Symmetry: C3
Subunit: 162 residues, 3 copies
């Protein structure tokens, strides 16, 4: 599986990107003094700092969207890697998703004008959709009747008693 080290490379960089979003979220909490729990708020000034902030909420939205997209990629991309796809095609799938998700986070936390973020979401979802369809294709043909699968390989049953 020559696509596997490519997948492990892109997938792990994405998980690390998610860890970075988490770190950013914490730092925004500190600087804005907006904590989710009263116990946190006491340690950093007092009870009034148990409150929401637009930037914290934005960070949480970016993190959630990552979870809604990157996690299924971790699954789909892994399985797809064992379907023996064209190595260059596989790279393209992984790279489009990686560039797209990084761009998504930049457009989100950077508050770029609409619909830039929405576009990056859709573009990144394209290779995921492709991998899902390809996996479904391979799983489905497993359950095709043996006679049909034989015919698709140019083999019809023989009436010759041999």
């Amino acid at each position: 599986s020559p696509a596997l080290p490519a997948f492990l490379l892109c997938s792990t960089l994405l998980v690390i990107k998610m860890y970075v979003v988490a770190i950013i979220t914490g730092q925004v909490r500190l600087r804005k003094k907006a904590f989710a729990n009263p116990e946190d708020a006491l340690r950093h000034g007092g009870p009034q700092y148990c409150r929401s902030d637009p930037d914290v909420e934005r960070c949480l939205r970016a993190h959630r969207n990552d979870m809604e997209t990157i996690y299924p990629f971790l699954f789909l991309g892994f399985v797809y890697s064992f379907l023996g796809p064209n190595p260059f095609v596989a790279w393209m799938h992984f790279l489009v998703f990686l560039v797209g998700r990084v761009a998504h986070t930049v457009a989100y936390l950077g508050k770029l004008r609409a619909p830039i973020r929405s576009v990056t979401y859709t573009l990144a979802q394209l290779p995921c959709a492709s991998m899902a369809l390809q996996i479904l294709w391979e799983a489905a043909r497993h359950f095709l009747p043996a006679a049909l699968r034989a015919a698709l390989l140019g083999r019809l049953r023989t009436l010759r008693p041999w």
Copy 2:
């Protein structure tokens, strides 16, 4: 692993179901004009459309619940597939989860009367619980003392010097 193509089939259909929930979420945002970000709201009418909506929140809750349930299934079901279970039993696990989760989303976005949704949640969780216990069983017996594992296979140590 004859259960594997069954698993890949159900698991991928579930990921696609999650993508559909995402799409529905976006469409509800458009129609209700309820955006999470001010930049989105400007592009689609103005700042007043940066607001929440009960349907958007409902969609987000359905998506989160999917994430809380389908993602561990992707993990448990995969590992379970390599434990060589009875193929029919494996199918049943995958199918109960698939039917249950689809039903869960229908009951959620369709606002059916309580406790229909809650019931579908519990029913779908049953095969997950079963797979988790079975995996734990197999992992645990790996760490059993060699003498005990031998005895469970009908082999006691021999005092005969051979």
Copy 3:
């Protein structure tokens, strides 16, 4: 892969811990009468019980944080298990993460003083960071030029025509 049954053991216990958080969340909803959906609220007293509660929100935050941390562990830990690491070192990674995450949930739902929870988060993230770096290391060296990889193995090219 001697680390694998160790991983499957810790990982599955963590998924079960997440299921328990879900169960706790439901019970807190019942006792506090704080439901997210109006249909649920009707079944359990009436429309006024469609409301938020600090404990429910806290439970949801704990569950989300689990999702932000345990899910990438399920991925990283699995891949790491096939990198043939030292069995004792692998155990340590899995055990630090398991103890840390359990401690995180206890500190969260138990409302312990800050920064206890935040500390357990960081400690648990340490083995994840280590596994991610190690995976990246192995993936990266796959794409090193063949000549460099040979040299790192003590093999320079030979000018002798043999």
